[PDB]
Paper text:
We crystallized the N-terminal half of SBV Gc (aa 465–874 in the glycoprotein precursor) produced in recombinant Drosophila S2 cells. The N-terminal head domain (aa 465–702) constitutes the first arm of the V. It is an α-helical bundle with approximate dimensions of 6.5 × 4.0 × 3.5 nm in size with a molecular mass of 27 kDa. The stalk can be further divided into two subdomains (aa 703–798/ 799–874). Despite having low aa sequence identity (18%) with each other, the two stalk subdomains share a common fold with a root-mean-square deviation (RMSD) of 3.2 Å over 64 Cα atoms, indicating that they derive from gene duplication. Each stalk subdomain has a molecular mass of ~19 kDa and comprises two antiparallel β sheets packing against each other. Moreover, each stalk subdomain is internally stabilized by three conserved disulfide bonds, with the corresponding cysteine residues conserved between them and across OBVs.
The OBV M segment encodes two glycoproteins, Gn and Gc, derived from a single polyprotein precursor, with Gn encoded upstream of Gc. Compared with other bunyaviruses, OBV Gn is relatively small, with an ectodomain of about 200 amino acids (aa), whereas Gc, with an ectodomain of ca. 900 aa long, is about twice the size of its Gc counterparts from other bunyaviruses.
Numbering used by the authors: 467 to 874
């Protein structure tokens, strides 16, 4: 059957049916549509809700991962299918740019089945992108011996495979993959890979990988599944913590004092709940780059990173008309949330933040850090620098966008 990803029903909130709403499954490979045209079918309030987000092809996956309600995530995934066809389908072109990530992971995270007999064609496919044409047919009996009746190993390799596929289907596909990982419902992966394979026939490497995913999904093993507990519009409607005061902040702010998570949905018509943050009981838009703990005061919330350099945008004016449930605060677990005392420095530079110069370093991970005036390298590595004076205190990355006039 077919479903409407713009207005997904309660019965259709399963991995089997949610997989039909992955952007690539829309079979739209060209002609991007402007955002104002994509959203003209929906309600006026939903239209203001989306226009307020300033969606583009660079931020829509972050809005998808950052959203809390599954209907909203599906909706933004459809918007991505309409807004970024080339980006959505670039992975299926052989050796394309979008292929760099999954292959990379495939070389770094060796499967457990590749510990012995590394000349198997699946191992050479993930390691050197060779023999990808015979991944399932080569040594299928030995790999069956390795997998059948061995749930431990099977789960190891399945986790590796899911992590690999998180870079093949970004957005909704990643949500479904993490859901599979949490529920251990490994057979449900057939609803994803089963839709990827007929579109990967030209990408011979991806084709071989997906064929092996099929093979391992056929393993004679038994694992009991964990309940799904996926957040739906129904969970939001049937919940407490109602807010009578839904007033938006007058002006944008940097520091969110007394933060609370908020999820707001319109009372009538088809709606997709929007995410907001309350700061001193004033409504602000939840940023696509995540909410972080202020490094200067960890009971305060910042947008995009821990330095409170990015402005919180006040909520739309119609927020008072919508219903709002307070939700538990969720902070970002991205690398910008965790501080480090030292790093291997690629280069030192100077950057103009808030109108003043600051010595910065780009570490090997690509992140930018303020560099202590007492920074120094460690004994056995000329690139390994203490970012703090005592080489113990943690220092947090900041987005390069808060810089201007970077000088290397
Ligand atoms: C896209 O093509 C697949 C076949 O590969 C089909 O199952 C699906 O329904 C199509 N999506 C549409 C028509 O929206
Ligand atoms: C799977 O393995 C078991 C042994 O654990 C075996 O008895 C059975 O025949 C195999 N095939 C199945 C269950 O289809
Ligand atoms: Cl087309
Ligand atoms: Cl993510
Ligand atoms: Cl810092
Ligand atoms: Cl950045």
């Amino acid at each position: 059957t077919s479903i409407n990803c713009k207005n997904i029903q309660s019965t259709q909130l399963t991995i089997e049916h949610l997989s039909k709403c992955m952007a690539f499954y829309q079979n739209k490979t060209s002609s991007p549509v402007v955002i104002n045209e994509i959203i003209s079918d929906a309600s006026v309030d939903e239209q203001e809700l989306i226009k307020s987000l300033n969606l583009n092809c660079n931020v829509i996956d972050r809005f998808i991962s950052e959203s809390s309600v599954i209907e909203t995530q599906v909706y933004y995934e459809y918007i991505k299918s309409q807004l970024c066809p080339l980006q959505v389908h670039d992975i299926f072109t052989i050796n394309s740019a979008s292929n760099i990530q999954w292959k990379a992971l495939a070389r770094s995270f060796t499967l457990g089945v590749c510990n012995t007999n590394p000349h198997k064609h699946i191992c050479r496919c993930l390691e050197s992108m060779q023999m990808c044409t015979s991944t399932k047919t080569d040594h299928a009996r030995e790999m069956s011996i390795y997998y059948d009746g061995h749930p431990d190993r099977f789960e190891h390799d399945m986790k590796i495979i899911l992590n690999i596929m998180r870079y093949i289907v970004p957005g909704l596909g990643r949500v479904l993959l993490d859901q599979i990982k949490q529920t251990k419902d490994y057979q449900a992966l057939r609803h994803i890979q089963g839709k990827l394979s007929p579109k990967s026939q030209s990408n011979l490497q991806l084709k071989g990988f997906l064929e092996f995913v099929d093979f391992i999904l056929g393993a004679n093993v038994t694992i009991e599944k964990t309940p799904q507990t996926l957040t739906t519009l129904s969970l939001i409607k049937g919940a407490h913590r109602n807010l009578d005061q839904k007033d938006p902040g007058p002006t944008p702010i940097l520091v969110c004092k007394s933060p609370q998570k908020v999820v707001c949905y319109s009372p009538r018509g088809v709606t997709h709940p929007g995410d907001y943050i309350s700061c001193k009981s004033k409504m602000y838009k939840w940023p696509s780059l995540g909410v972080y703990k202020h490094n200067r005061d960890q009971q305060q919330a910042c947008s995009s990173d821990t330095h409170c350099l990015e402005m919180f945008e006040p909520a739309e004016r119609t927020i008072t008309t919508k219903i709002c449930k307070v939700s538990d605060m969720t902070y970002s677990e991205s690398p910008y949330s965790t501080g480090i005392p030292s790093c291997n420095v690629k280069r030192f530079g100077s950057c103009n933040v808030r109108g003043h110069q600051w010595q910065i370093a780009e570490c090997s991970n690509g992140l930018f850090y303020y560099v202590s005036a007492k920074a120094h390298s460690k004994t056995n590595d000329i690139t390994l620098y203490c970012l703090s004076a005592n080489c113990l205190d943690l220092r947090y990355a900041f987005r390069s966008s808060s810089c201007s006039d970077i000088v290397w």
